[PDB]
Design a protein around this ligand. Structure first.
Ligand SMILES: NC(=O)c1ccc[n+]([C@@H]2O[C@H](COP(=O)([O-])OP(=O)(O)OC[C@H]3O[C@@H](n4cnc5c(N)ncnc54)[C@H](OP(=O)(O)O)[C@@H]3O)[C@@H](O)[C@H]2O)c1
Ligand SMILES: NC(=O)c1ccc[n+]([C@@H]2O[C@H](COP(=O)([O-])OP(=O)(O)OC[C@H]3O[C@@H](n4cnc5c(N)ncnc54)[C@H](OP(=O)(O)O)[C@@H]3O)[C@@H](O)[C@H]2O)c1
Lengths: 261, 261
């Protein structure tokens, strides 16, 4: 009785896994048999619930605080992971922030706020993952449908931040091959989280004239499956990418929008 | 009387047009009838020769020093352009630096060196272009075949800096449409300049024992036309994009590699 995609004996790290997509990814990898490093920057209590949830399904996990904007903290995060669990096999770079603004109004401060986490942060999470990971490991970064597949006015900064990631993973796969580590990205479409409700009004003309429920309902019709994307959808795909069965998917960006594009 | 393809009565600015691709673009736009702002960071003499060349073919030009890494100098550059010529119609963002290195070895310093110019710099050149341009104007940024079309080991940092640019211009076209300004990028393949010779050993099978000239000869075979790309090849395409007749190409990235991909 073959059960595919188990991660028994494996150790995974997920950045920003206290809440949102990261949280569901972390719990799912735990459910699949992996021990999990739950990284957070702010959401201490949320991260501890995630740790508790993973332990409850019969795995093990630890919540570690690190600001992914700070490269020395990324280094420390990965050293702590290895010192605690003994090895690290899977690294999922998930932390990101969203941004909207007409090009004409984008400040230096906002450019840097976004790129420092979404692009620079993810680049050095991948570097540190390469440095710490066991042979035959897995690195997954997080892009967006807005990188290439979906054009939203006033969304250039954020779209660009993930466009860089798409290019990163393709070349990362070449470099990381010398340790047989695969490197991919997931590019979610609208996925129901704190970030989604924060900006749902942009995926519609005007959009501020609807309730959060109406906007969510309207977003559900983007997919021909007529439902919203959920953190579990992303987790399902990350789970496969980081499994043994996922190996021949390498250097690729998978847009996870339920067929919207 | 308007002449099709020409740029008579227009004012153009090219970043880093003292040498390399920028210089060819700047001279070509001058040849097409545009008055030209020739930006440089270091190459004073080269920039002045560019200015003289544009004057020799019956147009006008001024060289203006500005470090494109510095957003306040971009502002200054565009301010001076508008003060000097009365208006600015065309902005070409060309300045860039190359980088190679395995992911594992990439430093904070190198990441920032590359992104501050290639990505952040170009983003803010686009912001200042929008801010200063006449209605119906043109903005072109510079990407690379390595963004999406060509994978080179140890080239993740630079490849990603241009992948951001690809996504930027697609969305910039939406924002800038409210002034009828088109925004595109050119994505050169290997193009014979100082930059090409620094890195051409990465582009060919095993070119270790080969001097610059031999590496260039070998790289000439990537294109099914069996020649190298030249700065004039890029200038030729820029000249069309920034013309009236180029209007319906908007929000796009054109890979200019003579058919190699
Ligand atoms: N949800 C969508 O519709 C959507 C669509 C496309 C792409 N994405 C991408 O999917 C990823 C997750 O999005 P989400 O919807 O789950 O976002 P979210 O609900 O806003 O959650 C953000 C996550 O990022 C973490 N984080 C923020 N700043 C951090 C920092 N400096 N260092 C470390 N972690 C930090 C947060 O942890 P703390 O609370 O501890 O700060 C939190 O866990 C992001 O990369 C996002 O760009 C989301
Ligand atoms: N050549 C290729 O094979 C190739 C391939 C793909 C993409 N590209 C892209 O095409 C563009 C031009 O490349 P190229 O081959 O002409 O490069 P190059 O020969 O190295 O020339 C670089 C140009 O950028 C300018 N520059 C450098 N730093 C600057 C700064 N801080 N501020 C303002 N300007 C600065 C330089 O001016 P100063 O001398 O005054 O510093 C110079 O004019 C770049 O964006 C490059 O990434 C080139």
């Amino acid at each position: 009785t073959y059960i595919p995609g188990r991660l028994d004996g494996k150790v995974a790290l997920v950045t920003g896994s206290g809440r949102g997509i990261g949280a569901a990814v972390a719990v799912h990898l735990g459910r699949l048999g992996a021990k999990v490093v739950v990284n957070y920057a702010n959401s201490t209590k949320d991260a501890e619930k995630v740790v508790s949830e993973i332990k409850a399904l019969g795995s093990d996990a630890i919540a570690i605080k690190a600001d992914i904007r700070q490269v020395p903290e990324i280094v420390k995060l990965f050293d702590q992971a290895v010192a605690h669990f003994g090895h690290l096999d899977i690294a999922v770079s998930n932390s990101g922030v969203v941004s909207f603004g007409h090009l004409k109004d984008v400040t230096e401060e906002e450019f840097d706020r976004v790129f420092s986490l979404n692009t620079r942060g993810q680049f050095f999470v991948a570097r540190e993952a390469y440095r710490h990971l066991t042979e035959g490991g897995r690195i997954v970064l997080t892009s967006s449908n807005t990188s290439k597949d979906f054009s939203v006015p006033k969304h250039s900064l954020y779209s660009g931040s993930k466009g860089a990631v798409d290019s990163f993973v393709r070349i990362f796969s070449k470099d990381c091959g010398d340790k047989k580590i695969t490197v991919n990205a997931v590019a979610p479409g609208g996925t129901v989280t704190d970030m989604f409700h924060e900006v749902s009004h942009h995926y519609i003309p005007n959009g501020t004239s609807y309730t959060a429920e109406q906007r969510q309902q309207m977003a559900a019709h983007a997919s021909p499956l007529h439902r919203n994307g959920w953190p579990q959808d992303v987790a399902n795909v990350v789970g496969f990418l980081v499994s043994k069965e996922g190996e021949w998917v390498n250097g690729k960006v998978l847009t996870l929008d339920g067929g919207a594009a």
